[PDB]
């Protein structure tokens, strides 16, 4: 690129967005700096009242410029080829069981400052939605598990506590001729591998209680740490799960019902664990689009919604260079972003603090 010269060093950006969201017009005037060098952000944005949508819901329309390229993909930058003139962004984001915000937006250079103008039209937005009824976290730690992890693991504690009632003492006799068996303690392997006199070789329930416990109160937990644990501990219960499962029948010949049930609630923290931990993704999706000289882009944001549910945007996403001079088409490759948001202190204003780290990665 020859825009690339002007992203050596450390270049003033200058954001203004004009809304209009089911009515509700705002506008929005943000200030910052880029460094592309280390691809990244550092942003303030005032809502010059109150804003009418959460901030991390324009997180995105709010600068792939500053995305570090490394150096065997600078051929593949877009976004400072464009420079000086510009780019035009176009987007299209659509909430899931909600309305849809329409964008448009030049980022060019006006002197030394980079400049994204933005005019943003929201529209069948439902006013007690996530998005107008603002139940949207912004950058919460403790939240809720929603209600789907709370009735399984409540109703999977229920249960293994009820085992303990059957084993310790509508018509389950035919369990505890299960939960008397072998395979009632320890999964009937923990006799084999640390002898019967150990402490670990508990009753199954025990580890049914520790297991959905732990499970519920990892659910109000929004670091890593806690999403893969939750992913090995709920492998461990699937596997666990599939092996009792698997004594029940073609073994023991009986069938109670608390093991069908608990062993489907097992499948069903599996697949939640699974998908909490896959799609945890801000990855753009970016292909060359030759027939406009510029580039298209999809990808998915999950917002954490209040009620410890989640929020699906996608968005679909087209740029434009705006001179008649030359442009890098790239090849399919994918954004690495990273933001933090936060607030200032001495800001009464409506705004948010945007830090932010963006890498190219891909081909
Ligand atoms: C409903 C339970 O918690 C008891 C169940 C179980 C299932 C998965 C993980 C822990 C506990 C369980 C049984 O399936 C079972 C099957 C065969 C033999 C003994 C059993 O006792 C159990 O603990």
Same mark, same amino acid.
Request: glycine residues 8%.
């Given at each position: 690129?020859?825009?690339?010269?002007?992203?050596?060093?450390?270049?003033?950006?200058?954001?203004?967005?004009?809304?209009?969201?089911?009515?509700?017009?705002?506008?929005?005037?943000?200030?910052?700096?880029?460094?592309?060098?280390?691809?990244?952000?550092?942003?303030? +944005?005032?809502?010059?009242?109150?804003?009418?949508?959460?901030?991390?819901?324009?997180?995105?329309?709010?600068?792939?410029?500053?995305?570090?390229?490394?150096?065997?993909?600078?051929?593949?930058?877009? +976004?400072?080829?464009?420079?000086?003139?510009?780019?035009?962004?176009?987007?299209?984001?659509?909430?899931?069981?909600?309305?849809?915000?329409?964008?448009?937006?030049?980022?060019? +250079?006006?002197?030394?400052?980079?400049?994204?103008?933005?005019?943003?039209?929201?529209?069948? +937005?439902?006013?007690?939605?996530?998005?107008?009824?603002?139940?949207?976290?912004?950058?919460?730690?403790?939240?809720?598990?929603?209600?789907?992890?709370?009735?399984?693991?409540?109703?999977?504690?229920?249960?293994?506590?009820?085992?303990?009632?059957?084993?310790?003492?509508?018509?389950? =006799?035919?369990?505890?001729?299960?939960?008397? @068996?072998?395979?009632?303690?320890?999964?009937?392997?923990?006799?084999?591998?640390?002898?019967?006199?150990?402490?670990?070789?508990?009753?199954?329930?025990?580890?049914?209680?520790?297991?959905?416990?732990?499970?519920?109160?990892?659910?109000?937990?929004?670091?890593?740490?806690?999403?893969?644990?939750?992913?090995?501990? @709920?492998?461990?219960?699937?596997?666990? $799960?599939?092996?009792?499962?698997?004594?029940?029948?073609?073994?023991?010949?009986?069938?109670?019902?608390?093991?069908?049930?608990?062993?489907?609630?097992?499948?069903?923290?599996?697949?939640? $664990?699974?998908?909490?931990?896959?799609?945890?993704?801000?990855?753009?999706?970016?292909?060359?689009?030759?027939?406009?000289?510029? =580039?298209?882009?999809?990808?998915? =944001?999950?917002?954490?919604?209040?009620?410890?549910?989640?929020?699906?945007?996608?968005?679909?996403?087209?740029?434009?260079?705006?001179?008649?001079?030359?442009?890098?088409?790239?090849?399919?490759?994918?954004?690495?972003?990273?933001?933090?948001? $936060?607030?200032?202190?001495?800001?009464?204003?409506?705004?948010?603090?945007?830090?932010?780290?963006?890498?190219?990665?891909? =081909?």
């Amino acid at each position: 690129s020859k825009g690339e010269e002007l992203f050596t060093g450390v270049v003033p950006i200058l954001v203004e967005l004009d809304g209009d969201v089911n009515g509700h017009k705002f506008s929005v005037r943000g200030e910052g700096e880029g460094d592309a060098t280390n691809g990244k952000l550092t942003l303030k +944005f005032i809502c010059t009242g109150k804003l009418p949508v959460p901030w991390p819901t324009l997180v995105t329309t709010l600068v792939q410029c500053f995305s570090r390229y490394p150096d065997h993909m600078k051929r593949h930058d877009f +976004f400072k080829s464009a420079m000086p003139e510009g780019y035009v962004q176009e987007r299209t984001i659509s909430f899931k069981d909600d309305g849809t915000y329409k964008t448009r937006a030049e980022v060019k +250079f006006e002197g030394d400052t980079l400049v994204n103008r933005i005019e943003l039209k929201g529209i069948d +937005f439902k006013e007690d939605g996530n998005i107008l009824g603002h139940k949207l976290e912004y950058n919460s730690t403790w939240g809720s598990p929603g209600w789907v992890r709370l009735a399984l693991c409540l109703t999977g504690l229920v249960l293994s506590l009820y085992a303990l009632h059957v084993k310790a003492a509508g018509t389950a =006799i035919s369990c505890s001729r299960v939960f008397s @068996s072998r395979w009632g303690r320890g999964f009937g392997l923990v006799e084999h591998v640390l002898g019967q006199d150990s402490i670990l070789n508990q009753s199954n329930s025990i580890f049914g209680c520790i297991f959905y416990t732990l499970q519920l109160l990892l659910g109000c937990l929004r670091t890593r740490w806690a999403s893969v644990l939750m992913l090995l501990s @709920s492998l461990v219960s699937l596997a666990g $799960s599939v092996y009792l499962a698997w004594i029940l029948f073609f073994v023991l010949y009986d069938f109670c019902i608390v093991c069908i049930t608990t062993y489907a609630i097992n499948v069903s923290l599996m697949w939640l $664990s699974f998908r909490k931990v896959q799609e945890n993704s801000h990855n753009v999706y970016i292909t060359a689009d030759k027939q406009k000289n510029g =580039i298209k882009a999809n990808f998915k =944001i999950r917002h954490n919604v209040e009620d410890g549910s989640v929020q699906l945007a996608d968005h679909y996403q087209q740029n434009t260079p705006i001179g008649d001079g030359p442009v890098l088409l790239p090849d399919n490759h994918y954004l690495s972003t990273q933001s933090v948001l $936060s607030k200032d202190p001495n800001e009464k204003r409506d705004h948010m603090v945007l830090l932010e780290f963006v890498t190219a990665a891909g =081909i």
